[PDB]
Amino acid sequence: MDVLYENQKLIANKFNSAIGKIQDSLSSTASELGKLQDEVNQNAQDLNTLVKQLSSNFGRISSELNDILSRLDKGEPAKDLRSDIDNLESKIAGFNSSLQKVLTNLAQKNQNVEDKLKGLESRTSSLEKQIKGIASNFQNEILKQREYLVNKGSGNVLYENQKLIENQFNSAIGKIQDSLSSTKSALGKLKDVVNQNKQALNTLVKQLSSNFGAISSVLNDIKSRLD
Amino acid sequence: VDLGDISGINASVVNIQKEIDRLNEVAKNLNESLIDLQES
């Protein structure tokens, strides 16, 4: 009947379908971000809890080592000193062994989060490109339809529908841009904390190895003296 | 022996709830951008 109205129905129905797919993508992104937030924060709490216990333990190891050193400097029987050294070395060995298992588990959990975050960054960047292209095509089609209504004015239904199509498209683009800024802000904050906490874990692994090496050096010197 | 203080190692927490909330809100708000044409 009215060919220009047929053109409007086609664009409106296609647009409404496209908006639904974008809505679903945003809801999915928000859910994935919430999961990453929870996991990042749990992993951070697990690392800080471990560091606090480790600091306490190393203080006690150093104190016991220095007490033994002072007893050697003062000159006591070797039997009692050897027994105390063997007990300390066994205590350090059990602390070392259990710690290795904890550190493996933490490293795996942290890398799982890093991998998921990189995947979501990739996914959302791909979606951004896709949506930009879809939106550009709609903008092109909508602007082209103006040319068929030059002889129309306010009150005419076709003219009103064209204004509505434009107004709704423009409002959607504004909301999509808001969503894009929020996605980018969240991903960047996650990336910063994940990187800082990865560096913290790597520093912890290195400092533990250094500390255990120094403890072994001192203990081996003590044992060499007990003769 | 003084092994230092391993407490200098610290993991940070993240807070992106504002952004998550805004994404969910915009997803809902897009319903107001759907086109309901007038009949010719």
Side-chain angles (χ1 to χ4, degrees), chain A residues 185-198:
Chain A
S185 178
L187 287 172
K189 294 174 174 183
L190 286 168
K191 187 180 196 195
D192 302 337
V193 168
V194 161
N195 200 248
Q196 282 187 22
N197 295 353
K198 176 166 90 134

Side-chain angles (χ1 to χ4, degrees), chain A residues 94-108:
Chain A
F95 167 61
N96 187 314
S97 153
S98 61
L99 178 52
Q100 297 311 321
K101 295 172 198 183
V102 169
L103 285 168
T104 292
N105 173 242
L106 260 174
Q108 275 166 16

Side-chain angles (χ1 to χ4, degrees), chain A residues 6-44 46-52 54-66 68-73 75 77-78 81-109:
Chain A
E6 294 294 323
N7 302 341
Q8 297 184 334
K9 288 187 291 174
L10 277 175
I11 61 171
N13 290 337
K14 281 158 199 194
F15 174 86
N16 290 341
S17 293
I19 292 298
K21 293 183 189 210
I22 289 161
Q23 285 177 304
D24 290 349
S25 293
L26 294 184
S27 291
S28 181
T29 296
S31 303
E32 286 314 303
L33 288 170
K35 285 182 200 150
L36 282 164
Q37 176 177 239
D38 290 339
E39 289 155 20
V40 166
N41 287 342
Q42 184 60 243
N43 292 348
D46 289 350
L47 188 47
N48 289 332
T49 290
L50 170 63
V51 160
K52 183 159 46 223
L54 293 179
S55 178
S56 187
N57 264 263
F58 278 123
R60 285 194 289 290
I61 289 166
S62 278
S63 178
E64 286 191 65
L65 217 45
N66 289 337
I68 288 164
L69 278 179
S70 80
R71 290 162 64 191
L72 278 158
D73 279 23
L81 268 180
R82 165 57 73 151
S83 164
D84 291 326
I85 294 166
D86 287 351
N87 282 348
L88 181 51
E89 193 179 359
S90 95
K91 190 174 118 273
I92 293 158
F95 167 61
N96 187 314
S97 153
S98 61
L99 178 52
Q100 297 311 321
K101 295 172 198 183
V102 169
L103 285 168
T104 292
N105 173 242
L106 260 174
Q108 275 166 16
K109 288 174 145 203

Side-chain angles (χ1 to χ4, degrees), chain B residues 20-37:
Chain B
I20 293 161
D21 283 356
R22 188 62 181 157
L23 276 173
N24 280 320
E25 184 62 23
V26 168
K28 184 182 73 203
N29 285 351
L30 275 166
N31 288 308
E32 307 310 302
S33 289
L34 298 172
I35 295 165
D36 290 309
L37 293 174

